[PDB]
């Protein structure tokens, strides 16, 4: 999304709410699958988009360390990780496309920036682990947004790189093929 | 709505312990001399002992894999510590921790595995998100085994999947890593030379080199 301008997003958002986004989740296209070079995703002003909030970034096991660098690069400090284990019709079964391990799981990093002490950001009632089975391709389980909602019950949310697979209440998304 | 299968391999279906028992005060010592090359290593890091001041680059052959442990908090700093030490991250296995107190809680029961037998009846009452109660804005209820690669007895790569489920220590004073991880090691690697550093007297393993200090 080098072509895209986030300036349009900032001017509308601040005037419209006076508040920058509380939470931000992304599923970056990694170089097909959106054909994105690692740098380009890595260099967008996500710092600009939200001032005092968490971020959520889904990292593939192959690409896990990289994104840690990435969120930490944007002025975040790593705090928590949410791991989802795929449930087939019964049990914990998952795809075997793991070179040394079968990968039956996905991990979503949580990054923290700014002051989150104040009242809206309620604490310590969350699932580190989600059990829901893989949904129609390609999608994240419904418990996440229900989880995020507990964290920031009445706040602005921003999703990035969202095919309008799950357009959501109070959620704003910028995507390629939406 | 899943149960039992998850808990089978994790617990209740190698007993004896004994190809070296290196003993030392590791702070004084250096590890280069001890026998190598080793094509795999396993550090029980639940204790969180500083590993940066560890020399592992020399001992490992050009090609090797490293298994490391963080029970909860230190997910990101292990990665730098290894990068500094020369290893590139490859995979994750999460030990997902189910509390024993929560399992034996309902319907009312006390002892222990007793709960293990009852997964048949138990399974009906509660869902995997309900027994995940555990003893940072989350109660992290996991431990993560971290895997690295250093260079360019069942072989197959998709042999053991990343997750496992266990029921938490009955006794607080337990500092062990489940014997099943060794099987993951030994299945994943058919190479004879493997190593465990910071081993107990209990944990020496056949055809493994255990290096430990006293207490």
Q: Domain for residue A121, yes or no?
A: yes
What does the alpha-carbon distance between residue B186 and residue B179 come to, in Å, rounded to a whole number?
Answer: 11
Query: Cβ B137–A123 below 8 Å, yes or no?
Result: yes
Backbone phi and psi for residue A125, each to the nearest 5 degrees, phi listed first: -135, 70
Residue B2 and residue A91 in contact, taking contact as beta carbons nearer than 8 Å:
yes
Query: Cβ B138–A92 below 8 Å, yes or no?
Result: no
Q: What residues have CB less than 8 Å from A15, skipping those under 6 apart? A: none
Unique residue bearing structure tokens 């260099």: A43
DSSP, collapsed to helix, strand or coil, labels residue A127 as coil
Unique residue bearing structure tokens 């490391």: B68
Q: Domain for residue A170, yes or no?
A: yes
Q: Where are the alpha helices (DSSP H) in chain A?
A: 7-17, 38-42, 46-49, 64-73, 143-151
Experimental method of this PDB entry: X-ray
Which residues in chain B are closer than 8 Å to A96, comparing Cβ atoms?
158, 161
Domain count of the fold of chain A: 1
Q: What residues have CB less than 8 Å from B21, skipping those under 6 apart? A: B204, B210, B212
Q: What residues have CB less than 8 Å from B131, skipping those under 6 apart? A: B98, B99, B102, B103
Nearest neighbour of B137 by CB, restricted to A78, A80, A94: A80
Residue A120 and residue A149 in contact, taking contact as beta carbons nearer than 8 Å:
no
Strand order, beta sheet including A105-113: A129-130, A77-85, A105-113, A53-59, A23-26, A157-160, A171-174
Question: Does A138 sit behind a cis peptide bond, omega within 30 degrees of 0 on the bond before it?
Answer: yes
Residue B145 and residue B86 in contact, taking contact as beta carbons nearer than 8 Å:
no
Residues A76-94: b if buried by 16+ CB within 10 A, e if exposed: beebbbbbbbbbeeebbbb
Q: Is A140 marked as a binding-site residue?
A: yes
CA A138 to chain centre: 14
Q: Domain for residue A150, yes or no?
A: yes
Query: Cβ B129–A101 below 8 Å, yes or no?
Result: no
First to last CA, chain A: 13
Q: Domain for residue A168, yes or no?
A: yes
Residue B24 and residue B181 in contact, taking contact as beta carbons nearer than 8 Å:
no
| β-sheet bridge partners, residue B22 | B211
What does the alpha-carbon distance between residue A72 and residue A109 come to, in Å, rounded to a whole number?
Answer: 11
Range of the domain at A106: 6-174
| Residues on chain B bordering chain A, Cβ-to-Cβ distance under 8 angstroms | 1-2, 5-6, 65, 75-76, 79, 83, 88-94, 96, 127-129, 132, 136-142, 147, 157-163, 188
Q: Domain for residue A39, yes or no?
A: yes
Residue B126 and residue B106 in contact, taking contact as beta carbons nearer than 8 Å:
yes
Q: Please name which of A14, A2, A65 lies closest in space to residue B90, comparing C-alpha atoms.
A: A65
Q: Domain for residue A93, yes or no?
A: yes
Q: Domain for residue A146, yes or no?
A: yes
Token representation of residue B43:
């550090």
The CATH number covering residue A47 comes to 3.40.50.150
Q: Domain for residue A1, yes or no?
A: no
Residues A24-58: b if buried by 16+ CB within 10 A, e if exposed: bbbbbbbeeeeebeeeebbebebeebbebbbbbbb
DSSP letters, A10-26, are HHHHHHHHSS--SEEEE
C-alpha separations of B96 from A30, A51, A82, A162, B166 in Å: 28, 34, 12, 30, 7
């Amino acid at each position: 999304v080098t072509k895209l301008n986030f300036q349009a997003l900032i001017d509308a958002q601040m005037r419209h709410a006076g508040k920058m986004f509380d939470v931000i989740m992304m599923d970056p296209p990694w170089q097909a699958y959106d054909s994105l070079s690692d740098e380009k995703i890595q260099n967008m002003p996500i710092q600009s988009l939200q001032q005092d909030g968490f971020i959520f970034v889904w990292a593939i096991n192959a690409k896990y360390r990289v994104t840690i660098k990435m969120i930490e690069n944007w002025g975040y400090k790593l705090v928590d990780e949410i791991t989802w284990v795929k449930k087939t019709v019964n049990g914990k079964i998952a795809k075997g496309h793991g070179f040394y391990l079968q990968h039956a799981k996905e991990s979503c990093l949580i990054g923290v920036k700014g002051d989150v002490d104040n009242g809206r950001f309620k604490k310590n009632i969350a699932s580190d682990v989600i059990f829901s089975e893989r949904r129609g391709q390609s999608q994240k389980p419904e418990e996440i947004y229900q989880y995020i909602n507990q964290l920031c019950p009445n706040g602005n949310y921003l999703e990035i790189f969202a095919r309008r697979n799950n357009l959501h209440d109070n959620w704003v998304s910028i995507g390629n093929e939406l | 709505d899943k149960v039992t299968c998850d808990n089978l391999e994790v617990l209740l279906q190698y007993e004896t312990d004994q190809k070296i028992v290196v003993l030392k005060k590791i702070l004084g010592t250096d590890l280069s001399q001890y026998a190598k090359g080793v094509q795999g290593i396993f550090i029980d890091n639940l204790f969180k002992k500083d590993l940066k001041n560890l020399d592992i680059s020399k001992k490992l052959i050009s090609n090797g894999i490293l298994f490391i442990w963080s029970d909860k908090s230190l997910i990101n700093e292990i990665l730098e510590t290894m990068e500094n030490k020369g290893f590139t991250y490859i995979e994750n296995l999460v030990v997902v921790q189910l509390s024993l107190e929560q399992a034996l809680e309902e319907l009312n029961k006390h002892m222990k595995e007793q709960t293990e037998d009852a997964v048949l009846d138990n399974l009906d009452f509660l869902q995997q998100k309900v027994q995940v109660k555990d003893l940072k804005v989350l109660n992290q209820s996991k431990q993560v085994l971290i895997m690295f690669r250093k260079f360019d007895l069942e072989l197959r790569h998709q042999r053991t999947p990343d997750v496992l489920f266990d029921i938490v220590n009955n006794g607080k004073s337990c500092l062990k890593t489940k014997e099943y991880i060794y099987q993951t090691i030994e299945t994943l690697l058919p190479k004879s030379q493997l190593m465990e550093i910071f081993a107990q007297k209990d944990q020496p393993r056949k055809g493994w080199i255990s290096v430990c200090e006293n207490k």
